[PDB]
Phate tail tape measure protein
Amino acid sequence: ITIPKNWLDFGWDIMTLDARQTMDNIETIINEFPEDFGTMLKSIDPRA
Amino acid sequence: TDDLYEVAEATYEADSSLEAFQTALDGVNTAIDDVAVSTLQTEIEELTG
């Protein structure tokens, strides 16, 4: 049963770490919207 | 008595050959001591891995 132990330690990152990988991508992707909103405020403002 | 001394020595042929059974049953244990204990090593390589 050390066969599992050998295969696990790298393999489980696909669940363990990839969640964190992909969320930071998602969180930075989402931050394009606060950016965009910031752009649209800075462009709507001069109408007044 | 002689007729029973023949039986005595007949018990002693069987006695002496039962020392041969000590070889055939007791020294013959050794395969146990091998196969129980030359046999983690093949599986330990999945620790080394």
Observations:
- Residues 14 and 20 of chain B are 9 Å apart (CA to CA).
- DSSP finds three helices and no strands in chain B.
- Chain B touches chain A at residues 43-44, 46-47, 49 (CB under 8 Å).
